[PDB]
C-alpha cells in the first residue's frame, strides 16, 4: 500500500553475523589496476636455494 519507503533509520547497524561467510564466486577475478606497484620492503632478502 503506502508503507514507509525510507530507512528506519534505527535499524540494525551491526553485522548479521550469520551473513555469507564464504567467498563469492562472482567476485572480481581481474587484477586491480591501481594496486601496490612499489617493491615490498618486507620481502624475501635471502637467496632462493632453488635458483638456477
Amino acid at each position: 500500500p503506502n508503507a514507509n519507503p525510507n530507512a528506519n533509520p534505527n535499524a540494525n547497524p551491526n553485522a548479521n553475523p550469520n551473513a555469507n561467510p564464504n567467498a563469492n564466486p562472482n567476485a572480481n577475478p581481474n587484477a586491480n589496476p591501481n594496486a601496490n606497484p612499489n617493491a615490498n620492503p618486507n620481502a624475501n632478502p635471502n637467496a632462493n636455494p632453488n635458483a638456477n
Binding site: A47, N48, P49, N50, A51, N52
Partner: protein, 224 residues
Amino acid sequence: QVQLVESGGGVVQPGRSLRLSCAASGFTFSNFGMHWIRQSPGKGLEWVAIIWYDGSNTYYADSVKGRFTISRDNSKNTLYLQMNSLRAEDTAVYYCAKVWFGESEDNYSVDVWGQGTTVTVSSASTKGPSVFPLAPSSKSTSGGTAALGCLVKDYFPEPVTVSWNSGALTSGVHTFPAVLQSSGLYSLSSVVTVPSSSLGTQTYICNVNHKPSNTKVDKKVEPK
C-alpha cells in the same frame, strides 16, 4: 648419453670419515650444478647437498649440516662429498644427480641420477657367515612337495651370494633379502621346494660365497 659413476663407498666405523666421488661424462660437467641424494630403507629418498656449477653456493640438509662438505673439480669433471663424523643413520645408498636445464627464473631439481654407491656405517668387524641347514621333514611336507633351505647367519658386511647345486637348481629357489640384527650382523635364508619323492636320493647342497672374507661354504642339507 649422460653418464654418472659413483665410487668410494664401503664400510666405515662410526666417527670416521669417507670421501665419495662422482665421475661425469657425456655432457659439459662444468656447466651444471649437482646434487647428492641418499636413499635408505628407513627414511626413503632424502636430499643431502647441492653445489652450484662454479662452487660459489652450496646448501646442505639440516641433518648433515656441519659434517658433510660437497665440492667439485671442474678440471677433472669430478664431484666430491667429504663425510666427517659419520653416525649410524647415515648408512644409505648415495646417488649423485645432475640438475636439469631450465629457464632463468624457474626452480630447479635433478633429471639424471647416477648409479649409486652403498655406504654402511657400522662398528661391526668383517666376519664370515655361519651356514645352518633348514632340514626338511614330515612337518615341512604337504602332498608331494617339500621345502628345504640354508640359513646364512651372522655375517658382515653385505653382500653374500647363495647358489644351489652349483647353479644346477634354480626352479623354485627363493633367497630372501638380508635382515640386520640387533648385533649389527646380517642374516638371511634361502629356500627351495622339491618333490617329496626325491628326498633321500637327490643330493642338495647350498653354496654360500662371501667375497669380503673370501668365504666359500658348501653345506649339505639332509632330511630328518
